[PDB]
């Protein structure tokens, strides 16, 4: 997601695994969050696709439902040839929201 500067990409060398998206993140681009013209499949590194993490959401980590894709603009800009777009951080909004809810 491009709306949170704190998040961090893994972007290691990609493997043969295919990324997945949950219900909330379905139909989006893993780089810019765009609903227009999915173009190319998303692949992730074998460290991300291991054990419990297998078949989870690329963006937030929820249960995987549908495949991930790159939008046409990212493919034109060759932003797809950069490594696994899996997010490794947990974010500041999520933890604070959880703590506020569990107040």
Partner 1 sequence: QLEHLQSKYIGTGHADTTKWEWLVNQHRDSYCSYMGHFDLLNYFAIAENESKARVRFNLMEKMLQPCGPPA
Partner 2 sequence: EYIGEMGKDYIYAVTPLLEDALMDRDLVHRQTASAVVQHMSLGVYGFGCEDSLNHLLNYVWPNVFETSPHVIQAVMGALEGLRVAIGPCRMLQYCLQGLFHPARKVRDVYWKIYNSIYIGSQDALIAHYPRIYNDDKNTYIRYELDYIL
Partner 3 sequence: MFLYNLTLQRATGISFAIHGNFSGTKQQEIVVSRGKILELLRPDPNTGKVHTLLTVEVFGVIRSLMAFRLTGGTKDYIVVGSDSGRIVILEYQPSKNMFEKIHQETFGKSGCRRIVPGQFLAVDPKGRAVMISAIEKQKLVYILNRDAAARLTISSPLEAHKANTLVYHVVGVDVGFENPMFACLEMDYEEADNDPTGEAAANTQQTLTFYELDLGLNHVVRKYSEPLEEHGNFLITVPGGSDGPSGVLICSENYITYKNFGDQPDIRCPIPRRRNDLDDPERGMIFVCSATHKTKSMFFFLAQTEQGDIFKITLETDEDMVTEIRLKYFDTVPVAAAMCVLKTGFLFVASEFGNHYLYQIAHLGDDDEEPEFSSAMPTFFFQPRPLKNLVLVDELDSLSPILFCQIADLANEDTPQLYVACGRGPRSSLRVLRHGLEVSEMAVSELPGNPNAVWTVRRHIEDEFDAYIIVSFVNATLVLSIGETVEEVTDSGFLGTTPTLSCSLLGDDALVQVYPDGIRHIRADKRVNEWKTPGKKTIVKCAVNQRQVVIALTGGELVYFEMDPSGQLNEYTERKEMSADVVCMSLANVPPGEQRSRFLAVGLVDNTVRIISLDPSDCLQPLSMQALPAQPESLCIVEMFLYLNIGLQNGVLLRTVLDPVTGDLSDTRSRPVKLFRVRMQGQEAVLAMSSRSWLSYSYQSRFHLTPLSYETLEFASGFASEQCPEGIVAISTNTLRILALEKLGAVFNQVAFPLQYTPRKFVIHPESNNLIIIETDHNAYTEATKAQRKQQMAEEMVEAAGELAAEMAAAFLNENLPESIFGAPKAGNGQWASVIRVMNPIQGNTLDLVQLEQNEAAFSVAVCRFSNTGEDWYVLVGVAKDLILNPRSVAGGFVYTYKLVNNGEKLEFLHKTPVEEVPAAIAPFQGRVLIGVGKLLRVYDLGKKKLLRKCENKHIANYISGIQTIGHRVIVSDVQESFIWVRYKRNENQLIIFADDTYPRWVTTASLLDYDTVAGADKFGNICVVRLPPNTNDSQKAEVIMNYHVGETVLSLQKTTLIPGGSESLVYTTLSGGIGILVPFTSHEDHDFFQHVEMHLRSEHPPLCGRDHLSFRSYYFPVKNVIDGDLCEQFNSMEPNKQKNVSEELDRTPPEVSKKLEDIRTRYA
- What does the binding site for partner 1 look like in residue numbers (CB under 8 A)? 5, 8, 11, 82
Site string for partner 2, 29-58 (x = CB under 8 A): -----x-xx---------------------
Structure tokens belonging to residue 41: 């499949």
Region of 9 on the Ramachandran plot (φ > 0 left; ψ -120 to 50 alpha; else beta): beta
Q: Are 41 and 68 in contact (CB under 8 A)?
A: yes
Q: Which residues pair with 83 in a beta bridge?
A: none
CB closer to partner 2, 12 vs 72: 72
Min CB(67)–RNA separation in Å: 19
CB closer to partner 3, 78 vs 100: 78
According to the annotation, is 39 in a ligand binding site? no
Structure tokens belonging to residue 61: 């980590």
According to the annotation, is 32 in a ligand binding site? yes
Closest alpha carbon to 85 in 61, 62, 67, 59: 59
CB closer to partner 3, 26 vs 67: 67
Under the binding rule (CB under 7 A), the answer on residue 37 touching RNA is no
């Amino acid at each position: 997601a491009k709306h949170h500067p704190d998040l961090i990409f893994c972007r290691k060398q990609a493997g043969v695994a295919i990324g997945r998206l949950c219900e909330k993140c379905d139909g989006k681009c893993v780089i810019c969050d765009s609903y227009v013209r999915p173009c190319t499949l998303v692949r992730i590194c074998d460290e991300c696709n291991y054990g419990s993490y297998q078949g989870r959401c690329v963006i937030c980590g929820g249960p995987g439902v549908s495949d991930a894709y790159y939008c046409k603009e990212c493919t034109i800009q060759e932003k797809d040839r950069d490594g696994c777009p899996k997010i490794v951080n947990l974010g500041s909004s999520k933890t604070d929201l959880f703590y506020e809810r569990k107040k």
